[PDB]
Design a protein around this nucleic acid. Sequence first.
RNA 1: GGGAGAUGAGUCUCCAGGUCUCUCGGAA
RNA 2: GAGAGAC
Length: 453
Amino acid sequence: GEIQWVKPNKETGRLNINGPTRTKLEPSVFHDIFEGNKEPAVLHSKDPRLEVDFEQALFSKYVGNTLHEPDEYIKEAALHYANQLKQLEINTSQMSMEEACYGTENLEAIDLHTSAGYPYSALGIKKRDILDPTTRDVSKMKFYMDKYGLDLPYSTYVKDELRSIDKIKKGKSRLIEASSLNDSVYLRMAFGHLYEAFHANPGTITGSAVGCNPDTFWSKLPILLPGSLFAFDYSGYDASLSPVWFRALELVLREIGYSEEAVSLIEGINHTHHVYRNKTYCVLGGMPSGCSGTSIFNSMINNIIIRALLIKTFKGIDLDELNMVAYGDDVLASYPFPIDCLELAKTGKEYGLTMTPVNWGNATFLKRGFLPDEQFPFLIHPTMPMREIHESIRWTKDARNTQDHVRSLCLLAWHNGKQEYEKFVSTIRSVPVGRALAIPNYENLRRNWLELF
RNA sequence: GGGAGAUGAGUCUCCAGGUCUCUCGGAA
RNA sequence: GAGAGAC
Ligand SMILES: Nc1ccn([C@H]2CC[C@@H](COP(=O)(O)OP(=O)(O)OP(=O)(O)O)O2)c(=O)n1
Ligand SMILES: [Mg+2]
Ligand SMILES: [Zn+2]
């Protein structure tokens, strides 16, 4: 993904898009009884903690495109995945605008707490000004659709979140591409049944884990991914997607029976315009972070990538023997034969992809490890590392949130086991706020977990 | 380093995506 | 009406 040009709004006639430059995060009452190195991310160019130029660090992820049209491997990969997908019998018909605004059984309503994006956010107009779940009204949506059209620019923001001190100094804060309400409804209408189909079938048919619940899914992954585990990580996945991969995604959607009108919307994601502060810019390639179905589309393309890298690197690969589950850029996979992931990364480089540093005892996925239950080793605990639970607990947007914050942390933390869950809890109970909280009890958590099966 | 508010240099406050999972509080 | 985490 690569910026083509940059132009000030004065010249592009664009409304200016500026959000906070101060974090809502501040140390909690637990900030000092727990260790951690994460601080809120740089929002402002003059952050005293910066050691790099802020904006050039922000946009250094747009590292360019290498390839614009599929080769034979990407084509075959895309046909393999597409053929695998046919058995889901995805409905290619357009979803109703009411369904796509207010949600179905397997696709949540458009989220009305967040911005309505360009131009709406800049006009002062909000999602709930236009959408109403009491009435289920689509009329006001039709109107603003007409008035403002589609393929509107994305609103670039900077994500206000905890990050590691190193990313703070490198200025590598996270850029958000806010979606216009119009493009969200339209993309959802085109692909909503596709979303519901994926959300409904986390696993190795979809090749995706969107919609998984780690508590039970984690026991399935060894059964789902037999053979030799290989995994790796991407650096800047979304931004390093060359157009070649959007061409491949369109072949999948065509193969699964989509009209050419629905397939056309993908080029609107390949090619995006963003307003950041008071300038606008073209981006060619790259998955815009906040479009509709990014995690579905990011996971679909990951299925294409892995397939394409295998058959281009190694002779004698049977793609039918590949097993893989993806969550956007995250990936766990297996194949009957062990895979040389360095050889893999060297051809990934030829496609403009950067992969970096495997059994069940070391694997991670959605940031959790795999820990067999000692009394029932076929049941797998997803293990959020305590070091990260510690990073979260040390900060707050709001002290009234403490009891709900700590309690979510406990539902992640206990999978690490009794001895570690009790260290965590007794550290919390060493300050008087912590002793006032209702803390879920370990045997209750384990008991309710086992009953899930 | 934009805009609005409160306040009278400054101080605080508001803006900030797509989805999934879990969970707290209201409802019939 | 909210939160927390994950991509
Ligand atoms: N608020 C967020 C955070 C992440 N993601 C998705 C987009 C890509 C991936 C980024 O994961 P990171 O937390 O940045 O971990 P990483 O892959 O190791 O680091 P990076 O993507 O910055 O290189 O998650 C997202 O859509 N929204
Ligand atoms: Mg990973
Ligand atoms: Zn353009």
